[PDB]
């Protein structure tokens, strides 16, 4: 009996400091530290999930390579407390659309939503950007786990719809 029905390669991209590695560690290991992480110590993380009746193995990178790793899905992360990281999403997307797989799936993530007093990008602004690009949007906090599992499951769900 085969271990899994599907293998999906996922890449997290976005400006330095937005929480890409923290999002991965929370999802894959259910850990979080405020302490600086230069490297997670491995090239990628593996987690297996269930989608309807299918077992899906997720192979996830928090660093670019090929540059986009032949990813089936790309999670674009900004920090809701950092306006520059949000504006730069426009550039990340532009590069994905030109240089990643032609029909790669995309998800917009606004991270650090636990920091309500430091927020400078509204949820509505995040949603507007995602809508303009025809992609889904989710706000997360790696710190308290809010929406982290949902973000990756949502990404997997979008890929599955495309590959059947
Ligand atoms: N308050 C809060 N801080 C976060 C969150 N995620 C990451 N951080 C902080 O942001 C820093 C940068 O995160 P990191 O994962 O290294 O960002 P990366 O450069 O995109 O890989 C971390 O060291 C944490 O201090 C979050 O969800 N909430
Ligand atoms: Mg990192
Ligand atoms: Mg700027
Ligand atoms: Mg800058």
Coordinates of C-alpha atoms and ligand atoms in Angstrom, one line a residue:
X1 CA 0.0 0.0 0.0
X2 CA 1.5 3.3 -1.2
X3 CA 2.4 5.8 1.6
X4 CA 0.6 8.8 -0.1
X5 CA -1.5 9.8 -3.0
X6 CA 0.1 13.1 -3.8
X7 CA 3.4 14.9 -3.4
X8 CA 3.1 18.7 -3.4
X9 CA 6.1 20.9 -3.3
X10 CA 5.5 24.3 -1.6
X11 CA 7.8 27.3 -1.3
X12 CA 7.4 30.2 1.1
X13 CA 8.7 33.5 -0.3
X14 CA 8.7 37.2 0.9
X15 CA 11.0 39.8 2.4
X16 CA 13.6 38.9 5.1
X17 CA 12.0 39.0 8.6
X18 CA 8.4 38.5 7.7
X19 CA 8.2 35.0 9.4
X20 CA 8.7 32.5 6.6
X21 CA 10.9 30.1 8.7
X22 CA 8.7 30.6 11.8
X23 CA 5.6 29.7 9.7
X24 CA 7.3 26.5 8.6
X25 CA 8.5 25.5 12.0
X26 CA 5.1 26.1 13.5
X27 CA 3.5 24.0 10.8
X28 CA 6.0 21.2 10.6
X29 CA 7.2 21.0 14.2
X30 CA 4.6 22.9 16.2
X31 CA 7.3 25.0 17.7
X32 CA 7.9 28.8 18.0
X33 CA 10.8 31.0 19.3
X34 CA 11.2 34.7 19.2
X35 CA 15.0 33.9 18.9
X36 CA 16.7 34.6 15.6
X37 CA 16.9 31.7 13.2
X38 CA 19.6 31.8 10.5
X39 CA 18.7 28.3 9.2
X40 CA 16.1 25.7 10.2
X41 CA 19.0 23.2 9.8
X42 CA 17.5 21.2 7.0
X43 CA 16.8 22.0 3.3
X44 CA 13.1 21.3 3.6
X45 CA 10.4 20.0 5.9
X46 CA 8.0 17.1 5.3
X47 CA 4.4 16.8 6.6
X48 CA 1.7 14.5 5.5
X49 CA -1.9 15.7 5.5
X50 CA -5.3 14.4 4.6
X51 CA -7.6 16.0 2.0
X52 CA -11.1 14.5 1.6
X53 CA -10.1 10.9 0.9
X54 CA -6.5 11.5 -0.3
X55 CA -3.2 11.4 1.7
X56 CA -1.0 14.4 0.6
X57 CA 2.7 14.6 1.3
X58 CA 3.9 18.2 1.5
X59 CA 7.6 19.0 0.9
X60 CA 8.2 22.6 2.0
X61 CA 11.1 25.0 1.6
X62 CA 11.5 28.4 3.4
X63 CA 14.3 29.5 1.1
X64 CA 14.6 29.8 -2.7
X65 CA 17.0 27.6 -4.7
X66 CA 16.0 26.1 -9.3
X67 CA 14.9 29.5 -7.7
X68 CA 11.3 28.3 -7.3
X69 CA 12.2 24.7 -6.6
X70 CA 9.7 23.4 -9.2
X71 CA 7.0 24.2 -6.6
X72 CA 3.3 23.4 -7.2
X73 CA 2.3 26.2 -4.8
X74 CA 4.0 29.4 -3.6
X75 CA 3.0 31.0 -0.3
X76 CA 3.8 34.7 -0.5
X77 CA 4.3 36.1 3.0
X78 CA 4.3 39.7 4.3
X79 CA 4.4 41.1 7.8
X80 CA 1.2 43.1 8.7
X81 CA 3.4 45.4 10.8
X82 CA 5.8 46.2 7.9
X83 CA 4.3 48.2 5.0
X84 CA 7.4 47.7 2.8
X85 CA 7.0 43.9 3.0
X86 CA 3.4 44.3 1.8
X87 CA 4.2 46.6 -1.1
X88 CA 7.0 44.2 -2.1
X89 CA 4.5 41.4 -2.6
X90 CA 3.7 43.1 -5.9
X91 CA 7.3 42.4 -7.0
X92 CA 7.4 38.8 -5.6
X93 CA 4.2 38.0 -7.6
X94 CA 5.5 39.6 -10.8
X95 CA 8.6 37.4 -10.6
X96 CA 6.5 34.2 -9.8
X97 CA 4.2 34.9 -12.8
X98 CA 7.2 35.2 -15.1
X99 CA 9.7 32.6 -13.7
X100 CA 7.8 29.9 -11.8
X101 CA 5.8 27.0 -13.3
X102 CA 3.1 28.5 -15.6
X103 CA 0.1 27.3 -13.5
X104 CA 1.7 27.5 -10.1
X105 CA -0.8 28.1 -7.3
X106 CA -0.4 31.1 -5.0
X107 CA -1.6 32.1 -1.6
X108 CA -1.1 35.5 0.1
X109 CA -0.3 35.4 3.8
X110 CA -0.2 38.4 6.2
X111 CA 1.8 37.2 9.2
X112 CA 2.3 38.5 12.7
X113 CA -1.5 39.4 13.2
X114 CA -1.0 38.9 16.9
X115 CA 0.8 42.3 17.0
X116 CA -2.4 44.3 16.9
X117 CA -0.9 47.5 18.2
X118 CA 1.9 47.5 15.6
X119 CA -0.3 46.6 12.6
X120 CA 0.0 49.0 9.6
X121 CA -1.6 46.9 6.9
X122 CA -5.3 46.3 7.3
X123 CA -7.0 42.9 6.6
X124 CA -9.1 44.7 4.0
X125 CA -5.9 45.9 2.2
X126 CA -4.5 42.3 2.2
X127 CA -7.8 41.0 0.8
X128 CA -8.0 43.7 -1.9
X129 CA -4.5 42.8 -3.1
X130 CA -5.3 39.1 -3.2
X131 CA -8.6 39.8 -5.0
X132 CA -6.8 41.9 -7.6
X133 CA -4.4 39.0 -8.3
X134 CA -7.2 36.4 -8.2
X135 CA -5.6 34.5 -5.3
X136 CA -6.7 33.6 -1.7
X137 CA -5.7 35.4 1.4
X138 CA -5.2 34.4 5.0
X139 CA -3.8 36.2 8.1
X140 CA -1.6 34.2 10.4
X141 CA 0.4 34.2 13.6
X142 CA 3.3 31.8 13.8
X143 CA 3.7 32.9 17.4
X144 CA 0.3 31.7 18.7
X145 CA -0.4 29.3 15.8
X146 CA -3.5 31.2 14.5
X147 CA -4.4 30.1 11.0
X148 CA -1.0 28.5 10.4
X149 CA -2.4 25.0 9.7
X150 CA -5.2 26.5 7.7
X151 CA -2.8 28.5 5.5
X152 CA -0.9 25.3 4.4
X153 CA -4.1 23.2 4.1
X154 CA -5.7 25.9 2.0
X155 CA -2.5 25.9 -0.3
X156 CA -2.7 22.1 -0.6
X157 CA -6.4 22.3 -1.4
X158 CA -5.8 24.8 -4.3
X159 CA -3.2 22.5 -5.8
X160 CA -5.4 19.4 -5.5
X161 CA -8.2 21.2 -7.4
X162 CA -5.8 21.9 -10.3
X163 CA -4.2 18.4 -10.4
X164 CA -7.7 16.8 -9.9
Ligands
LIG1 N1 4.8 38.6 17.1 C1 5.1 37.7 16.1 N2 6.4 37.7 15.7 C2 6.8 36.8 14.7 C3 5.8 36.0 14.1 N3 6.5 35.2 13.2 C4 7.8 35.6 13.2 N4 8.0 36.5 14.2 C5 9.2 37.2 14.5 O1 9.9 37.6 13.3 C6 11.2 37.2 13.3 C7 11.6 36.8 11.8 O2 11.0 35.6 11.5 P1 11.6 34.6 10.5 O3 10.8 33.3 10.5 O4 13.1 34.3 10.8 O5 11.5 35.4 9.1 P2 12.1 35.1 7.7 O6 13.3 35.9 7.4 O7 11.0 35.4 6.7 O8 12.5 33.6 7.6 C8 11.3 36.0 14.2 O9 12.6 35.9 14.8 C9 10.2 36.4 15.3 O10 10.8 37.3 16.3 C10 4.4 36.1 14.5 O11 3.6 35.4 14.0 N5 4.2 37.0 15.5
LIG2 MG1 14.3 32.4 7.2
LIG3 MG1 8.7 50.7 0.2
LIG4 MG1 13.1 47.6 1.4

